[PDB]
Design a binder for this molecule. Structure first.
Ligand SMILES: O=C(O)c1ccc2cc[nH]c2c1
Ligand SMILES: [Ca+2]
Ligand code: NA
Ligand code: NA
Length: 225
């Protein structure tokens, strides 16, 4: 099935990504607080709702929040400044707070129910966000021998997410805080602050995509060049 692409709002970042964030894939962005990872998540939650000639998939979004990073008024602002109705856009983002890593897993199962429900409607789910995906796992699995268990649990969680992406043709977008641990996202993107208030993006361990870095801004429209 054809891979769909969601624009990030930034022409530069979209180019680095080969056109945007892909369905049937997990894209992981990681970086320090304020690197743009959460701003990008919010922007994508709006962009996915647009028609394809505007960089979206005529879809809705789901947002799993682990560290209280979700800001409804930020979504409304991004929407308003892109010519969209802020309340309608907010209503197309299904929010859930994950209380711990086990609840986080249950939420992914519940997400499947909604995805199935909307799959053949005029606005299917096309984006599932997990912000700070590892935070609960790092808090809960800690100490001697915790590495193996934590990595196994994360691998299973990521396998569940890969299944949703592939089975239902959705983009999964996950964020993490910032070197020898394994990772199983399809594509990993490192974000960092640059000069002039810009953020800089670099693909990590992606020999299949061309060499370069993207530059973008955080504005009233979310993310743009
Ligand atoms: O409202 C819901 O049914 C629901 C279930 C799971 C998730 C995961 C992110 N948002 C959700 C909403
Ligand atoms: Ca951010
Ligand atoms: Na895939
Ligand atoms: Na709606």
């Amino acid at each position: 099935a054809t891979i769909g692409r969601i624009s990030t709002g930034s022409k530069s970042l979209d180019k680095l990504l080969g056109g945007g964030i892909e369905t049937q894939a997990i894209t992981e962005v990681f970086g320090e607080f304020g690197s743009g990872k959460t701003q990008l998540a919010h922007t994508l939650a709006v962009m996915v709702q647009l028609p394809p000639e505007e960089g979206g998939l005529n879809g809705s979004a789901m947002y799993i929040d682990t560290e209280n990073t979700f800001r409804p008024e930020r979504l409304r602002e991004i929407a308003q400044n892109r010519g969209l109705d802020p309340d309608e856009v907010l209503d197309n983002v299904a929010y859930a707070r994950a209380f711990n890593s086990n609840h986080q897993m249950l939420l992914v199962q519940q997400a499947e129910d909604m995805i199935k429900e909307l799959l053949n409607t005029d606005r299917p789910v096309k984006l599932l966000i997990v912000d700070s995906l590892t935070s609960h796992f790092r808090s809960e699995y800690i100490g001697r021998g915790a590495l193996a268990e934590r990595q196994q649990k994360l691998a299973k969680h990521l396998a569940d997410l890969h299944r949703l992406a592939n089975l239902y043709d959705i983009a999964v977008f996950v964020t993490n805080q910032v070197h020898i641990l394994a990772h199983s996202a399809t594509l990993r993107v490192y974000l960092r602050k640059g000069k002039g208030g810009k953020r800089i993006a670099r693909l990590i361990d992606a020999p299949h995509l061309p060499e370069g870095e993207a530059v973008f801004s955080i504005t009233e429209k979310g993310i743009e060049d």
